[PDB]
């Protein structure tokens, strides 16, 4: 049975009663010197009674594979490698340096934006000094800081042309009757749009505008549009380069907000749609690459006064495209109320409904919402009030579950008034009224 | 330690032996049937003879009890004292008792097993010494006065400590307390050991398995939002899932499917372990109900798989095994089911595997692609594998028929896959 | 240089360095001989106090030590010092310039091995005196016979045999006639640990991939194999209180307890020792004891006890996880700033580059304890930043 034979131990003899510990393995009181293999067997039995012989050695000699892989590995989650998506209800935030900390602000932060490709943040508040920071995870500084007197700005944003991408125009507007454009060129040249061509009796303010591309659809002069709000039901679409009134659209009932959804048509063609709400909450969905006339209209399931609508998932204002072929049909729409109830709608079946039911109607933050923005890829929704402290929630979607681990009570959010995302970095930025803008990042991106 | 607890240990050690008349009657008065002042006047022969009558009627309704007649319910058993004999024959005694207890785990709805087990309680003292197997054998009947009785007379083990405010209370212990009993792996390793003995005796049945599975999915539900606890709790539930599939009963096999589906939707597992689970639940699949449930659980297992490589090829030895257990027309009628469960990722991997490891019968893939709708990255990877297949083997009418179907819906997909690989002029050359 | 005012005394606050320790029994006691750089130290294992130190340093650093009953065999650059009660009792100069690597003690024959697969074995002049003092012979393993050495030991019930564990092969010896007896089979990867088993004549040996082979040397086979994904294994042990438990220690700071009667992981332990300082350098069960003594390279020694089971009927299937028991540590990086606490020269404070603060006690070296970073809560309403 042995694979080897020593051929030396069998010719040995040991007097076992020389000492105390080797004299118990005798068998008679007359035997003194014993043979070698007998000696091996005797002390082998002594070993087997000094530690017993368990069953796992004489078990064997090396529908099963579940047990085999389960006994192999420890970490039973694949998410170490790729993960390609978010994990629900527990996200991987970390904190970064406070983005206002280099050169602080004094008023609230009513607008906050990112450059679409360059690593640039824009901050704008009621103290009429629009600052621009270069932001990074360690120490983030102020590139420039334009100040403009007599115009406390409310909302301001970046813009690049889709065609030749070398324009980089800021647009800014406050409660006054003029807005400003800026071609940024690392002493500034800014223009003051105030020429209202068609309608001059519907703007007590310019304090709500968006910017959006469109195609010509007989030629392909892809160019900008400023979309300003009015007072009765009016939202006016201008030009961004020139300043011409392109046209306007009035909905019935008071405008509360609006958003822009593009959709591709062919390889090189696309179509823009404007979505607008009341306080009542019946929306108009009309394209405006042809003349602005309503092609769909339906009604939100609920809301007495709804406050803020934001589309996302594909491309939008906050996540813009660079090449014209890089533009994408959206997926998610979201409508938010003064009661706090945010409905979020899918838009892959709800172009057919004419009264669509919500995918989810969530309510976690109690008071009225002010800002809500999607991720650039459409997995996080970000909701925030302007009423109480720590009034922001993050929602994983398509599962439509609020993240539990963040934000806790101990997060230093402050009374939030604005929020924005990165175009790519997964770098999130929140601003409050007491001045500071803080910076987090999402480690999955 | 101190003297008081230092001899409370020896009091608990020798609680089984009666030392005088008062402790003798306080020990003898424990009974599953009669109350205290009735039970304190019974003798051993009385309960033995009515228990032997209960046993023989229980043995004609179940033919596997005459062995316990021969060795545990014999006439010498009323003289056999427990705590007077050595550790090896007390080991024989209580493993025989455990055999009886798992065997009579089913019969507790009917009173012959109550009168059969009450002499076993009164003589061999299982209500103090052999308490664990008793509790987790009769734990299924927790809304029953037999369990309220047996918990009123039991001395409570250190594991089942959540029940100690349910002794001598008329309320039966509730389902939430049963979950909080099941909610630590010190209890769970015990209960998986017990289920392993039930499997290798085939004493499994439809009520114990139902209760066990329901508490396991409730444990996973409580440990939903605890990632460390859930990852701690994997290798016991999956362990008895694999030990549960090794048996023959359709009920324990679909119970294994139940814990597998709820665990897969509880947390995202890895591709290798979910493929081993898929081939394991396939490798012992016999009855039709097991076929149906296993197909549902395979589809949901693959639906809860994220990350890249999710819709990749299942390999050859799992693919041919899936085709051996499940023919193609069963897949076709399951996809023809009107409820339409979401099975898109499994059907995507099935299409890529039938196109790569069989490459012969493409009527199947065309038919089921007509029968379901499917998303864009899935159909992109399918038509990429079809491009590679159409260039390795010569084109057929079926291949070009499904190709022109993918022309007829969503042209620019196969156009962009040709832009990745060649040109539509070259594809029309290979037409 | 030599001085004339200050004489050096002791390097306090130092527990381990990363050399695998050894253990020894005396009656029903247990002592742990650990290495600290150049001198070693002898703790006990019951209360884990210090007991002994070497009375004077070594020339080089100690590379390998072992322990029989009273005696401690230290091994550095060229020699092996047989020590008693922390006092050197006999040098043994080896017959080479090659640096010694490993050693083992059994019966009469001491056996040390250098760094070129050359094994000096020594023998006691009288089969009654206390330590091997006399050179017996010099075996030499050649590269035909196996790889370069990684351990050696005499596993039990073998009549004057020995087991050299190389990087590719296991090979026995009969040390009386100087003969090789049984080369083993071929092994396809580098093995790095081999510890014997308390069952008859088998040895568990773990590789650089995470598998443990269990070689049966009498049979010349392997019995089982424990596979573990991509773990650089470092230190095996077995538990000998009857209930069979294997324990592997992975240099990623892991300690995995395997059952062997049913091939199951009993409990894993993650990040027990720090990764970057070597991980689990040496971990062992005290024999006949349900405790574990681990030591890392990060200046830390720990004891983990196995509790009794809670299932009084089931027993060996339900195993309680290991608790944490006594441990002795210092900070694992060189200390930045140093103060003296009291006028009596009893306590002193260290703060190290690994950002920990310790209060060492230079009077009695079990009083040294880490200061704790648990903030007093702001009782004016604020939140801790």
């Amino acid at each position: 049975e042995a694979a080897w034979i020593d051929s030396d131990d069998e010719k040995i003899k040991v007097p076992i009663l020389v000492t105390n510990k080797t004299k118990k393995l005798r068998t008679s009181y007359n035997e003194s010197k014993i043979n070698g293999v007998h000696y091996i067997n005797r002390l082998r039995s002594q070993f087997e009674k000094i530690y017993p012989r368990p069953k796992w050695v004489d078990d064997e000699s090396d529908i099963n594979a579940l047990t085999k892989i389960l006994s192999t590995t420890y970490n039973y989650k694949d998410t170490l490698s790729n993960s390609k998506l978010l994990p629900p209800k527990k996200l991987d935030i970390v904190r970064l340096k406070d983005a206002n900390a280099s050169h602080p602000s004094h008023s609230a932060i009513q607008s906050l934006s990112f450059h679409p490709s360059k690593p640039l943040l824009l901050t704008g508040g009621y103290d009429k000094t629009l600052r621009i920071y270069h932001i990074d995870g360690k120490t983030n500084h102020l590139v420039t800081s334009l100040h403009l007197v007599g115009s406390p700005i409310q909302t301001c944003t970046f813009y690049t042309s889709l065609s030749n991408q070398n324009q980089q125009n800021i647009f800014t507007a406050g409660r006054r009757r003029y807005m400003h454009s800026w071609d940024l060129s690392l002493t500034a040249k800014i223009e003051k749009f105030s020429r209202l061509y068609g309608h001059e009796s519907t703007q007590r303010s310019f304090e709500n505008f968006k910017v959006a591309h469109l195609q010509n659809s007989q030629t392909n002069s892809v160019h900008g549009i400023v979309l300003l709000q009015g007072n009765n039901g009016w939202i006016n679409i201008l030009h961004s380069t020139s300043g011409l009134w392109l046209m306007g659209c009035k909905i019935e009932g008071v405008i509360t907000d609006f958003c822009i959804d593009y959709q591709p048509i062919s390889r090189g063609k696309f179509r823009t749609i404007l979505i607008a709400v009341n306080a009542y909450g019946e929306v108009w969905e009309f394209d405006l690459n042809k003349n602005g006339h309503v092609i769909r209209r339906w009604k939100d399931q609920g809301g007495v006064g709804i406050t803020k609508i934001q589309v996302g998932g594909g491309t939008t204002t906050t996540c813009p495209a660079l090449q014209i072929s890089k533009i994408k049909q959206n997926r998610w729409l979201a409508v938010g109320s003064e009661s706090g109830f945010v409905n979020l709608y899918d838009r892959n079946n709800a172009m057919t409904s004419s009264t669509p039911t919500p995918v989810a109607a969530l309510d976690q933050l109690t008071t009225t919402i002010s800002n809500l923005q999607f991720s650039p890829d459409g997995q996080i929704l970000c909701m925030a009030s302007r009423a109480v402290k720590d009034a922001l929630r993050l929602v994983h979607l398509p599962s439509c579950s609020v993240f539990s681990n963040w934000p806790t009570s101990g997060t230093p959010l402050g009374k939030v008034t604005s929020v924005a995302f990165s175009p790519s970095g997964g770098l999130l930025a929140v601003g409050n009224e007491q001045g500071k803008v803080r910076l987090w990042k999402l480690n999955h991106y | 330690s101190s003297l008081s607890d230092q001899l409370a240990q020896v009091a608990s050690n020798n609680a089984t032996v009666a030392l005088d008349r008062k402790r003798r009657q306080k020990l003898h008065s424990a009974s599953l049937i009669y109350n205290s002042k009735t039970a304190a006047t019974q003798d051993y022969d009385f309960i033995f003879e009515n228990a032997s009558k209960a046993l023989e009627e229980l043995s004609q309704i179940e033919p596997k009890f005459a062995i316990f007649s021969r060795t545990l319910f014999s006439e010498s058993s009323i003289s056999l004292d427990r705590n007077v004999q050595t550790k090896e024959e007390i080991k024989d005694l209580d493993n025989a008792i455990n055999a009886y207890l798992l065997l009579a785990s089913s019969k507790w709805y009917l009173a012959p097993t109550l009168h059969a087990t009450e002499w076993l309680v009164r003589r061999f003292q299982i209500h103090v010494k052999n308490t664990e197997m008793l509790l987790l054998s009769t734990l299924n009947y927790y809304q029953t006065p037999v369990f309220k009785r047996i918990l009123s007379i039991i001395k409570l083990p250190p594991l089942f400590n959540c029940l100690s405010n349910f002794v001598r209370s008329e309320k039966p212990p509730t389902a939430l307390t049963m979950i909080k009993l099941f909610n630590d792996m010190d209890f769970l390793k015990l209960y998986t050991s017990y289920l392993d003995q039930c499997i290798k005796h085939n004493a499994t049945y439809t009520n114990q398995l139902l209760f066990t599975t329901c508490c396991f999915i409730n444990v996973v539900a409580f440990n939903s939002n605890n990632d460390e606890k859930l990852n701690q709790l994997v290798p016991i539930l999956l362990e008895i899932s694999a030990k549960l599939l090794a048996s023959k009963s359709k009920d324990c096999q679909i119970a294994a499917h139940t814990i597998l589906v709820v665990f897969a939707t509880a947390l995202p597992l890895k591709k290798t372990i979910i493929l081993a689970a898929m081939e394991t639940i396939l490798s012992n699949l016999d009855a039709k109900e097991a076929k149906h449930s296993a197909l549902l659980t395979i589809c949901k297992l693959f639906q809860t798989l994220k990350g890249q490589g999710n819709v990749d090829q299942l390999p050859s030895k799992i693919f041919k095994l899936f085709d051996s257990k499940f023919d193609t027309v069963s897949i076709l009628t399951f996809l023809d089911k009107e409820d339409k469960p979401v099975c898109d990722k499994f059907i995507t991997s099935y299409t890529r595997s039938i196109a790569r490891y069989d490459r012969s019968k493409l009527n199947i893939i065309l038919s089921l692609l007509k029968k379901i709708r499917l998303e864009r990255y899935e159909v992109r990877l399918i038509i990429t594998d079809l491009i590679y297949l159409s260039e390795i083997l010569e084109d057929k009418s079926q291949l070009v028929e499904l190709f022109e179907y993918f022309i007829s819906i969503n042209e620019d997909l196969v156009l962009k896959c040709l832009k990745s690989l060649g040109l539509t002029g070259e594809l029309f050359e290979i037409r | 240089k030599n001085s004339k005012i200050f004489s050096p005394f002791r390097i306090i606050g130092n527990v381990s360095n990363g050399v695998p320790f050894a253990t020894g029994t005396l009656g029903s006691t247990f002592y742990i001989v650990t290495c600290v750089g150049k001198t070693f130290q002898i703790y006990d294992a019951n209360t884990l106090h210090l007991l002994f130190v070497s009375e004077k340093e070594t020339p080089s650093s100690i590379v390998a030590l072992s322990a029989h009953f009273h005696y401690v065999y230290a091994a550095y650059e060229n020699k092996v010092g047989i020590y008693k009660r922390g006092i050197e009792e006999h040098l043994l100069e080896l017959e080479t310039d090659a640096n010694v690597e490993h050693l083992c003690i059994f019966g009469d024959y001491l056996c040390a091995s250098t760094d070129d697969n050359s094994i000096f074995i020594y023998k006691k002049s009288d089969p009654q005196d206390k330590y091997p003092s006399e050179f017996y012979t010099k075996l030499t393993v050649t590269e035909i016979q196996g790889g370069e050495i990684v351990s050696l030991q005499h596993l039990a019930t073998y009549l004057n045999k020995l087991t050299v564990v190389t990087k590719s092969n296991v090979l026995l010896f009969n040390v009386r006639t100087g003969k090789l007896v049984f080369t083993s089979n071929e092994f396809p990867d580098q093995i790095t640990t081999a510890e014997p088993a308390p069952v008859l004549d088998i040895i568990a040996l773990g590789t650089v991939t995470g598998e443990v082979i269990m070689f049966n040397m009498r049979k010349g086979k392997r019995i089982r194999t424990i596979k573990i994904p991509q773990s650089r294994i470092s230190s095996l042990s077995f538990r000998t209180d009857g209930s069979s438990h294997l324990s592997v220690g992975t240099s990623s700071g892991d300690l995995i307890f395997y059952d062997l009667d049913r091939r199951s992981r009993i409990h894993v332990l993650k990040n027990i020792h720090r990764e970057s300082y070597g991980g689990v350098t040496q971990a062992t069960f005290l024999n006949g004891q349900p405790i574990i003594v681990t030591s890392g390279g990060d200046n830390s020694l720990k004891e983990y006890v196995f509790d009794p089971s809670l299932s009084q009927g089931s027993g060996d299937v339900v195993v309680q996880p290991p608790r944490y028991l006594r441990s002795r540590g210092g900070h694992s990086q060189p200390p930045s700033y140093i103060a003296f606490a009291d006028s009596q020269s009893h306590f002193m404070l260290s703060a190290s580059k690994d950002r920990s603060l310790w209060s060492f006690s230079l009077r009695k070296d079990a009083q040294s304890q880490e200061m704790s970073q648990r903030l007093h809560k702001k009782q004016d309403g604020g939140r801790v930043g």
Binding site: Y51 | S1 | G27, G107, L310
Partner: peptide, 28 residues
């Protein structure tokens, strides 16, 4: 009431160990 996960005073019981002294021999 939860399960009393409870430690105790631990004690080092008696060792019982094979020693290697009886593993050598000599030619007589």
């Amino acid at each position: 009431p939860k399960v009393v996960r409870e430690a105790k005073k631990v004690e080092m019981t008696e060792a019982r160990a094979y020693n290697a002294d009886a593993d050598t021999a000599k030619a007589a």
